[PDB]
Amino acid sequence: SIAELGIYPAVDPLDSTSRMLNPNVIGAEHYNVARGVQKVLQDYKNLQDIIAILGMDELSEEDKLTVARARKIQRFLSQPFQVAEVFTGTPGKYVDLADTISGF
Amino acid sequence: ILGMDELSEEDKLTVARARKIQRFLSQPFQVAEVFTGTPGKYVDLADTISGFQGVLTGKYDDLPEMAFYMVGDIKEVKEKADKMAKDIASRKEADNKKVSEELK
Amino acid sequence: SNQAVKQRIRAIKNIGKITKAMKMVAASKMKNAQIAVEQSRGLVDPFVRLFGDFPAVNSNKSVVVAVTSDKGLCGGLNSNITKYTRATLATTESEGKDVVVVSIGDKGRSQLTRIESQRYQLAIADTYKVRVTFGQASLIVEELIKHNPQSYQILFNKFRSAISFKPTVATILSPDLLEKQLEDVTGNSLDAYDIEASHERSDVLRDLTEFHLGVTLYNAMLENNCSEHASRMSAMENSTKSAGEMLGKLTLDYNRKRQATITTELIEIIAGASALM
Amino acid sequence: ALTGLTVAEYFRDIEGQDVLLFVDNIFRFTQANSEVSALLGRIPSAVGYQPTLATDLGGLQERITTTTKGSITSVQAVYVPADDLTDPAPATTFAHLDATTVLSR
Amino acid sequence: EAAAPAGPKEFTEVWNKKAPSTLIVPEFPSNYTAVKAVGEGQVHGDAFPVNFYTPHSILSQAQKDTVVLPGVDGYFGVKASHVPTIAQLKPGVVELHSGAESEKFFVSGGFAFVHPNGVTDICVLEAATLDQVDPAAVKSALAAASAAQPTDEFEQAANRAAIELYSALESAVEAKA
Amino acid sequence: VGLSVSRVGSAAQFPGMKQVAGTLKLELAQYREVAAFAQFGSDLDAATQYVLERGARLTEMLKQKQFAPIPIERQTVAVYAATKGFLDKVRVQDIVAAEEAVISQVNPAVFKILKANGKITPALDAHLKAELRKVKLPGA
Amino acid sequence: VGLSVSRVGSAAQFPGMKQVAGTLKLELAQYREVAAFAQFGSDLDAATQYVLERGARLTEMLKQKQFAPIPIERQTVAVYAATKGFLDKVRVQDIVAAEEAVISQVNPAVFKILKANGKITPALDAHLKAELRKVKLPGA
């Protein structure tokens, strides 16, 4: 489902787990942004069954902000790979850890 | 789920036409008339093509759905559609003037 | 193919809770907007016991309004108004009278054009977004007064209860362009009253019919909003019924597929083991 | 369950009483006989059950009857496997049942 | 001159000829009013039905014995079997009396009819009780309303209505009983 | 009735019942059609209300009690009195007593003529239309 | 919570926690019945909105933080402070900080009484109830 949207790498953000996701291992500033990104991508999925039916006409100016922020997060998890220059068009990006922590 | 009240007018047109061409594909058989009672019809291929083209283009949107049910060709749709309409009035005057009183 | 059915049960169950939410939403909006509907029902009465009810009058120019809903799960309310639009708009036709048709609500903009497209001039929409106020109905009356017919027709649904909304045509005649001309019998019935205006009677009726148009338009689009909410409450009542009977059929067929899956995998395992022993 | 049946059948046939038998979870009787049918190397029937499911159930339930001496009335707790009444263990049990008393929360 | 005698009954009869016959007759505003003008009665001595209405309220519908209406010629009063009237009201105090007790609604203007059957229908837009106005903001606004005096007769007519409503509000708030 | 079928026994049944029951199959067919259209009651055509009332009369006619089978002439007359008029006075509840009143109050010679002849002759149709008018229906 | 049961049940619960969990599970049952309708916020209901708001409070109560297990008197003081209403003021997304704002600010002599007596007596209920209003919750 992530690949048919064009988000590449099509990593399922909720379903991908690690044992390095403890706050006493990778710090709290990494842990809480990862858990916050996961919570926003999860309640977006809980809203997504009603966006596909009703269409963002009721969404309370915070759940509308949830949908917008989660669409920004969903696009921002995508990244052009250095080995996929043959596939789509793009030069590949190496992203450091502090840069993606600050960005998300 | 949502009924035909939620459809587009294009969708309502294709639902009406498709119900008419669903009923028009049905046909009385000559071998089925001993238990259905309706005499069967052999529909020629030219009549089939012409009738289904007319129901496709919208030449017979004036006719109801049940005028197409269990008829041979498109002459009989218009015959049955006149007959269903004509009856819509004739439902009585079997009150007296019988052949079934005591001295007939 | 056994996971297509489980996700279809997922789809039907989420649809069936969405429609059950929207039923309660429409029921919640129906009670706290009935407290504004039968408040405004009173002011329509002095104008009908003063001016009377003259729907079939031979107007030269007529502006007919079909006030409908904006959102679309109302369930055949707006289509019933679109058919009573032509049903009451062909009963005016006696001498080739001019008619302007006007729709209040987005779902009347799409539906009158199928039937009367050359006689369409205005679409008022986004009217129930915040609420309905009398200044709003006054502005809609102003833009219906920019071109000035001899009669007005307003088609809406009278909110009787949460069950019945039997639709209503309310008629408003221009001041002496036809209204006092419909009042004169062996004299007149309007001449009983002492006009206590500043200027003449021809201007007190000019102000009085714009006030009657504003009151009728306000009450029409308030009654139509409350009947819309009750029609949606009755429309999402049948949607959860349909999404429950479809769910029950799908649950039975899933149980069949579950049993057949266990039997076929078991027959495969037994046939594998029996080919060795 | 056959041992409880024998204790009840003595009160029916010798004492002449209206006995009550309580088979607590008739489904566990079914599941136990399915296990002993699987362990004796028999091919399982539909969904996963013993091929003799109807007769291994009917051998128990047909001894619960009214004789000319007395009767046995059986109150059997019924578990429905996947909330599926068309599963063969409750569909075979419900052929034998004369009443249900559904206790509700 | 009145050669089209319409009504609910005539529209019912003609509408059964041009519409399809299965459609029930559309309702009319006459069908929800039991009170008319020419229907004689509803008087019963000293107290008369006062239908004080509003677009967003119904302020009174019970029978009262005397109503002071602020018409454009000046304040007048309505007793029971009054003459039929169609009175345009200037912004003033509609006084409802039932005896010694008086409730004073200051309205925004809008018409007030007295019918032949003695029913009176006061029909105004903003009809506030005079309790809920403050005496400070009226002259505070009239000081500005006496300043912006343009040649734009739309804005000048709005200024005229502004100074006249504000002056009537002031003269009704200093003159309490 | 929409799924039950018997094609080899058809045109091999009781001739009076075959004369009466084609109208019954057709009226239950239209009852199934208008119950397939309106499973909720708010939009009444008053001709759809007619086929609803006739279908509800007939499905009350065909339902019967246990361990008491009826002879075929007493079923022919009972569905003759229902596929025609003769029962629209009775509302929807008292039809089970109405058909028992019809079987009881009809002169039992016409059952012998219907059994012996095989079908309703026009003399028997005349006497049957006559005899179904002097019947005291419990819905009155 | 809907699918997790205990066939032993509340006979083996901490008393005092049994005083508050019995209404906690009822409030969470009502919240689960009205759940998934919280996406309708602009579409407010004013009787189910209270149980929806309090259910969103209480699901934020029972969250924990990975190998910091809590002693039972601190748990039932937290379920008291969330159940009886002393955290109805605080916004729904900082109740996890309002919980240790209750645990660390209520003086720990209460915990000794609730552990040693093993129930919330009114002699402790009045003192704990007074101690639950002088907490400096992160609220506005």
JSON list of N, CA and C in Angstrom, two decimals, chain E residues 46-66:
[
{"chain": "E", "resi": 46, "resn": "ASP", "atom": "N", "xyz": [-62.32, 42.60, 27.30]},
{"chain": "E", "resi": 46, "resn": "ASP", "atom": "CA", "xyz": [-61.28, 43.59, 27.52]},
{"chain": "E", "resi": 46, "resn": "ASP", "atom": "C", "xyz": [-59.91, 43.17, 27.01]},
{"chain": "E", "resi": 47, "resn": "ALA", "atom": "N", "xyz": [-59.62, 41.87, 26.98]},
{"chain": "E", "resi": 47, "resn": "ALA", "atom": "CA", "xyz": [-58.30, 41.37, 26.61]},
{"chain": "E", "resi": 47, "resn": "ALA", "atom": "C", "xyz": [-58.33, 40.86, 25.18]},
{"chain": "E", "resi": 48, "resn": "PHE", "atom": "N", "xyz": [-57.30, 41.19, 24.41]},
{"chain": "E", "resi": 48, "resn": "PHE", "atom": "CA", "xyz": [-57.25, 40.79, 23.01]},
{"chain": "E", "resi": 48, "resn": "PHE", "atom": "C", "xyz": [-55.94, 40.09, 22.71]},
{"chain": "E", "resi": 49, "resn": "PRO", "atom": "N", "xyz": [-55.93, 39.15, 21.75]},
{"chain": "E", "resi": 49, "resn": "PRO", "atom": "CA", "xyz": [-54.70, 38.40, 21.45]},
{"chain": "E", "resi": 49, "resn": "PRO", "atom": "C", "xyz": [-53.64, 39.25, 20.78]},
{"chain": "E", "resi": 50, "resn": "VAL", "atom": "N", "xyz": [-52.47, 39.32, 21.41]},
{"chain": "E", "resi": 50, "resn": "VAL", "atom": "CA", "xyz": [-51.34, 40.12, 20.95]},
{"chain": "E", "resi": 50, "resn": "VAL", "atom": "C", "xyz": [-50.24, 39.18, 20.50]},
{"chain": "E", "resi": 51, "resn": "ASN", "atom": "N", "xyz": [-50.08, 39.03, 19.18]},
{"chain": "E", "resi": 51, "resn": "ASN", "atom": "CA", "xyz": [-49.10, 38.11, 18.62]},
{"chain": "E", "resi": 51, "resn": "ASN", "atom": "C", "xyz": [-47.80, 38.86, 18.37]},
{"chain": "E", "resi": 52, "resn": "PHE", "atom": "N", "xyz": [-47.12, 39.18, 19.46]},
{"chain": "E", "resi": 52, "resn": "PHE", "atom": "CA", "xyz": [-45.82, 39.85, 19.38]},
{"chain": "E", "resi": 52, "resn": "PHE", "atom": "C", "xyz": [-44.79, 38.84, 18.90]},
{"chain": "E", "resi": 53, "resn": "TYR", "atom": "N", "xyz": [-44.37, 38.98, 17.64]},
{"chain": "E", "resi": 53, "resn": "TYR", "atom": "CA", "xyz": [-43.47, 38.06, 16.96]},
{"chain": "E", "resi": 53, "resn": "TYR", "atom": "C", "xyz": [-42.12, 38.71, 16.73]},
{"chain": "E", "resi": 54, "resn": "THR", "atom": "N", "xyz": [-41.21, 37.93, 16.16]},
{"chain": "E", "resi": 54, "resn": "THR", "atom": "CA", "xyz": [-39.81, 38.24, 15.93]},
{"chain": "E", "resi": 54, "resn": "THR", "atom": "C", "xyz": [-39.34, 37.18, 14.94]},
{"chain": "E", "resi": 55, "resn": "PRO", "atom": "N", "xyz": [-38.36, 37.45, 14.06]},
{"chain": "E", "resi": 55, "resn": "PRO", "atom": "CA", "xyz": [-37.78, 36.37, 13.26]},
{"chain": "E", "resi": 55, "resn": "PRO", "atom": "C", "xyz": [-37.14, 35.26, 14.08]},
{"chain": "E", "resi": 56, "resn": "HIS", "atom": "N", "xyz": [-36.55, 35.58, 15.22]},
{"chain": "E", "resi": 56, "resn": "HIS", "atom": "CA", "xyz": [-35.85, 34.58, 16.01]},
{"chain": "E", "resi": 56, "resn": "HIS", "atom": "C", "xyz": [-36.53, 34.27, 17.34]},
{"chain": "E", "resi": 57, "resn": "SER", "atom": "N", "xyz": [-37.75, 34.74, 17.55]},
{"chain": "E", "resi": 57, "resn": "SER", "atom": "CA", "xyz": [-38.46, 34.46, 18.79]},
{"chain": "E", "resi": 57, "resn": "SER", "atom": "C", "xyz": [-39.95, 34.59, 18.58]},
{"chain": "E", "resi": 58, "resn": "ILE", "atom": "N", "xyz": [-40.70, 34.21, 19.61]},
{"chain": "E", "resi": 58, "resn": "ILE", "atom": "CA", "xyz": [-42.09, 34.59, 19.77]},
{"chain": "E", "resi": 58, "resn": "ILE", "atom": "C", "xyz": [-42.16, 35.16, 21.17]},
{"chain": "E", "resi": 59, "resn": "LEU", "atom": "N", "xyz": [-42.30, 36.47, 21.28]},
{"chain": "E", "resi": 59, "resn": "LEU", "atom": "CA", "xyz": [-42.16, 37.11, 22.58]},
{"chain": "E", "resi": 59, "resn": "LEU", "atom": "C", "xyz": [-43.44, 37.08, 23.39]},
{"chain": "E", "resi": 60, "resn": "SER", "atom": "N", "xyz": [-44.59, 37.02, 22.73]},
{"chain": "E", "resi": 60, "resn": "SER", "atom": "CA", "xyz": [-45.86, 36.94, 23.42]},
{"chain": "E", "resi": 60, "resn": "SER", "atom": "C", "xyz": [-46.91, 36.41, 22.46]},
{"chain": "E", "resi": 61, "resn": "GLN", "atom": "N", "xyz": [-47.80, 35.58, 22.98]},
{"chain": "E", "resi": 61, "resn": "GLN", "atom": "CA", "xyz": [-48.95, 35.14, 22.21]},
{"chain": "E", "resi": 61, "resn": "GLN", "atom": "C", "xyz": [-50.23, 35.08, 23.03]},
{"chain": "E", "resi": 62, "resn": "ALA", "atom": "N", "xyz": [-50.16, 35.34, 24.33]},
{"chain": "E", "resi": 62, "resn": "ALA", "atom": "CA", "xyz": [-51.35, 35.35, 25.16]},
{"chain": "E", "resi": 62, "resn": "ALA", "atom": "C", "xyz": [-52.11, 36.66, 24.99]},
{"chain": "E", "resi": 63, "resn": "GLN", "atom": "N", "xyz": [-53.34, 36.68, 25.50]},
{"chain": "E", "resi": 63, "resn": "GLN", "atom": "CA", "xyz": [-54.23, 37.82, 25.33]},
{"chain": "E", "resi": 63, "resn": "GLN", "atom": "C", "xyz": [-53.91, 38.92, 26.33]},
{"chain": "E", "resi": 64, "resn": "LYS", "atom": "N", "xyz": [-53.77, 40.14, 25.84]},
{"chain": "E", "resi": 64, "resn": "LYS", "atom": "CA", "xyz": [-53.53, 41.31, 26.68]},
{"chain": "E", "resi": 64, "resn": "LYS", "atom": "C", "xyz": [-54.64, 42.33, 26.46]},
{"chain": "E", "resi": 65, "resn": "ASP", "atom": "N", "xyz": [-54.74, 43.29, 27.38]},
{"chain": "E", "resi": 65, "resn": "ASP", "atom": "CA", "xyz": [-55.84, 44.25, 27.35]},
{"chain": "E", "resi": 65, "resn": "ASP", "atom": "C", "xyz": [-55.50, 45.60, 26.74]},
{"chain": "E", "resi": 66, "resn": "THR", "atom": "N", "xyz": [-54.23, 46.03, 26.79]},
{"chain": "E", "resi": 66, "resn": "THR", "atom": "CA", "xyz": [-53.82, 47.27, 26.14]},
{"chain": "E", "resi": 66, "resn": "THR", "atom": "C", "xyz": [-52.36, 47.22, 25.72]}
]
